Amino acid sequence: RPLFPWFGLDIGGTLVKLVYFEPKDITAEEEEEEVESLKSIRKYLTSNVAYGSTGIRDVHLELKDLTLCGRKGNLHFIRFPTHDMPAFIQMGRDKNFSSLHTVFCATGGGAYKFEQDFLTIGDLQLCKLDELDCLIKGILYIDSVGFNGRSQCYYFENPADSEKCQKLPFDLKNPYPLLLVNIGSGVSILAVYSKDNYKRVTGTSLGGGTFFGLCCLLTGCTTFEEALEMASRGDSTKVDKLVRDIYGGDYERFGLPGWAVASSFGNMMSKEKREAVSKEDLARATLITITNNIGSIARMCALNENINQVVFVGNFLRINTIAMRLLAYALDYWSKGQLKALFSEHEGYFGAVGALLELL
Amino acid sequence: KRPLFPWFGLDIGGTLVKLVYFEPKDITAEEEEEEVESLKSIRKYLTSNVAYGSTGIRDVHLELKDLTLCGRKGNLHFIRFPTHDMPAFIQMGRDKNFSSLHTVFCATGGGAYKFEQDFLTIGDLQLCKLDELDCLIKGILYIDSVGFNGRSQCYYFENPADSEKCQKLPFDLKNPYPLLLVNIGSGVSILAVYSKDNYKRVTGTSLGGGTFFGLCCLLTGCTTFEEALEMASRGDSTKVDKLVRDIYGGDYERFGLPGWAVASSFGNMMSKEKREAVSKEDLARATLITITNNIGSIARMCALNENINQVVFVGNFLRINTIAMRLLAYALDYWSKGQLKALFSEHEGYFGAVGALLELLK
Ligand SMILES: Nc1ncnc2c1ncn2[C@@H]1O[C@H](COP(=O)(O)OP(=O)(O)O)[C@@H](O)[C@H]1O
Ligand SMILES: Nc1ncnc2c1ncn2[C@@H]1O[C@H](COP(=O)(O)OP(=O)(O)O)[C@@H](O)[C@H]1O
Ligand SMILES: CC(C)(CO)[C@@H](O)C(=O)NCCC(=O)O
Ligand SMILES: CC(C)(CO)[C@@H](O)C(=O)NCCC(=O)O
Ligand SMILES: [Cl-]
């Protein structure tokens, strides 16, 4: 077995995801034998919810009483900005991390980008793993163990109507084939036919990084939480041109209802229209623009590949039920109920979990 | 049999209204005798001005010269104004007695529906409402058949990525079927066209010319489409976007994404340091690239799935926009290994108005 601490790391374009297994079956004789530095890092991780200026433990994602590699313990889910990787590597140097063990399993593009820095500054060797391989392994494992007596995955029934929208549970029991849409900084779209057989069908650079980046420019927001806050009190219809702004109603010949967006941000060439919108409106418009584009591309991929279940993951979906409901409606409405959107509780961490499972 | 002059086709879109006008160059003194005074003044109003009111523009360089149409010889003009100024156009309609020219005017686009009642009450005119996509098909097929004053209507870019070798070469739309037609307006409609009577709307995207123009106005303070493109021509998108390189330190080799490909459009703009580094021009360039490559990607997927190898891109998003045309041409060529060809047109934004004109003449 590998030595503690057991970590999986996913170094993305925007966020670094870190999954840590805290063993809870340490005997007296093990505690006796254990090194001070290991004891210190373990209590640093489990007694702090914030780490430095930017690191955060998502306490309510904690999976309790899992059995991994013959040990009973808890899974912790931790993230920080990729921008703060130099501080992270410096920490490994200063905390003597190579003495606990020299090799760590890491995925994401940062596993390649930062390899030399880890080696030179930290004296650490990365076991580099593919970001989409790790994603698949992680979602399947996290699904099979469940979420402390609740389901890992779910779907939205009647996602368009706030009068009847329900979040209902769903299992990946016999899940294949499935389309997996990974919404990070960019978007990858995977057709998955078994645990071992899958292909990257397409992607789009209009991802969560485009949402967050545009919001910062358009609204002066600086955090994702603030962007979403603004979006949840905004009205996109003031910013966008709807089909009814162009037709005065539906474009029935081609089944385009008046409420559908004809042109994203399409009113903003008008000074009068620009003057009447708020930062909140611009945030919401950015949200629906990016989401509906992804939804449309996933729909086309789903129908072409003859796949009816589409799973949406990635940290774009954090605190983003607005996006999840739009994606749900987008697939259901335009496919007349043939296509189904599925979502997950640990949306951003499956890659890091995959890196941890590889270790073990 | 044919209707009396004047002959017009109208396309009232989300952003622009397009008017096509056949100027007769075969008017006899005898016909003039029979013509009403409102017709005489409107004809000279159209031909002696290249700018109408506050915002009307005649695209003089598109004029089709010495055309024969329904037994009459003359020139076809192409005129545009913002849909925002429709109230003034309708009022001008009453001031210039448009109803004494004709009771009915042929109109396509969403605005043919939206402004119908206004045109009747204020303007004294009935609109003959016609389908925007049908008129688009009839217009491009007609305009291609006549050609552009000796030149071809449609064309492609050979070697679009390299300014050393980039060439605009003619493309004959004789036996063109099947083709994908990508109409880039405020929004985008994507058609698979199997014949002149047989086509379907495959899909579309709301991320269109209106998204490019709207975002550019918000992000840069530009007020015109021309300014937006001028700004984009002097910008560097790689300060704005996050490349595959920025994430991987090179290519993502497993799935063949080269280091230089965009991973996340506007992805650097979460960083305050990066935001302070960029200019208005960089943002305009990033906006142009993001909207264009997204349309290209979507069109590529439609073309491949429908087994269509020819994609004609139209709409006023592409007006004075050789940069976006070259990006579309490159992206389709590169990401399909030379299997898909991008085609473009000289009268990009006026095909629907032409269709409305042809409907008028039977
Ligand atoms: N606290 C946060 N900081 C930055 N981005 C966040 C945050 N919360 C959610 N996001 C969203 O998550 C996206 C990155 O998602 P992720 O799945 O981690 O992909 P990547 O591998 O590109 O980092 C961002 O583009 C943003 O939209
Ligand atoms: N002078 C202009 N004014 C406004 N938009 C322009 C102009 N020139 C080009 N455009 C572009 O053309 C688009 C409108 O395209 P068009 O094909 O006329 O569609 P629509 O029918 O939606 O008006 C705008 O969104 C903008 O991108
Ligand atoms: C480069 C990755 C794979 C990094 O996760 C992702 O950001 C992405 O797939 N971006 C855009 C993909 C595309 O243009 O198809
Ligand atoms: C509504 C029209 C047809 C009007 O030109 C056009 O703007 C459009 O096709 N918009 C995109 C709608 C969509 O496909 O989602
Ligand atoms: Cl006339």
PDB file of C-alpha atoms and ligand atoms in Angstrom, chain A residues 243 246-247 251 256 261-263, chain B residues 132 186-189 201 203-206, ligand 4:
ATOM      1  CA  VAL A 243     -37.530  35.891 -31.021  1.00  0.00           C
ATOM      2  CA  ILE A 246     -37.862  40.428 -33.836  1.00  0.00           C
ATOM      3  CA  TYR A 247     -41.214  38.778 -34.821  1.00  0.00           C
ATOM      4  CA  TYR A 251     -41.562  32.181 -35.710  1.00  0.00           C
ATOM      5  CA  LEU A 256     -39.107  29.102 -32.645  1.00  0.00           C
ATOM      6  CA  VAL A 261     -33.311  33.986 -27.418  1.00  0.00           C
ATOM      7  CA  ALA A 262     -32.834  35.083 -31.050  1.00  0.00           C
ATOM      8  CA  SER A 263     -29.635  37.034 -30.386  1.00  0.00           C
TER       9      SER A 263
ATOM     10  CA  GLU B 132     -37.309  34.859 -44.238  1.00  0.00           C
ATOM     11  CA  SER B 186     -28.167  39.129 -35.248  1.00  0.00           C
ATOM     12  CA  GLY B 187     -28.656  35.394 -34.641  1.00  0.00           C
ATOM     13  CA  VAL B 188     -27.726  32.430 -36.834  1.00  0.00           C
ATOM     14  CA  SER B 189     -29.865  29.971 -38.815  1.00  0.00           C
ATOM     15  CA  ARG B 201     -33.408  24.316 -40.782  1.00  0.00           C
ATOM     16  CA  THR B 203     -30.293  24.294 -36.157  1.00  0.00           C
ATOM     17  CA  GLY B 204     -29.085  27.777 -35.215  1.00  0.00           C
ATOM     18  CA  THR B 205     -27.330  29.767 -32.506  1.00  0.00           C
ATOM     19  CA  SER B 206     -28.216  32.938 -30.675  1.00  0.00           C
TER      20      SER B 206
HETATM   21  C1  LIG C   4     -34.954  34.270 -34.978  1.00  0.00           C
HETATM   22  C2  LIG C   4     -34.138  34.336 -36.262  1.00  0.00           C
HETATM   23  C3  LIG C   4     -34.591  33.209 -37.190  1.00  0.00           C
HETATM   24  C4  LIG C   4     -34.456  35.689 -36.899  1.00  0.00           C
HETATM   25  O1  LIG C   4     -33.514  36.033 -37.904  1.00  0.00           O
HETATM   26  C5  LIG C   4     -32.619  34.248 -35.977  1.00  0.00           C
HETATM   27  O2  LIG C   4     -32.177  35.356 -35.171  1.00  0.00           O
HETATM   28  C6  LIG C   4     -32.175  32.959 -35.320  1.00  0.00           C
HETATM   29  O3  LIG C   4     -32.214  31.932 -35.988  1.00  0.00           O
HETATM   30  N1  LIG C   4     -31.716  33.011 -34.056  1.00  0.00           N
HETATM   31  C7  LIG C   4     -31.195  31.835 -33.356  1.00  0.00           C
HETATM   32  C8  LIG C   4     -32.279  30.988 -32.680  1.00  0.00           C
HETATM   33  C9  LIG C   4     -31.732  29.628 -32.263  1.00  0.00           C
HETATM   34  O4  LIG C   4     -31.469  28.787 -33.144  1.00  0.00           O
HETATM   35  O5  LIG C   4     -31.567  29.370 -31.050  1.00  0.00           O
END
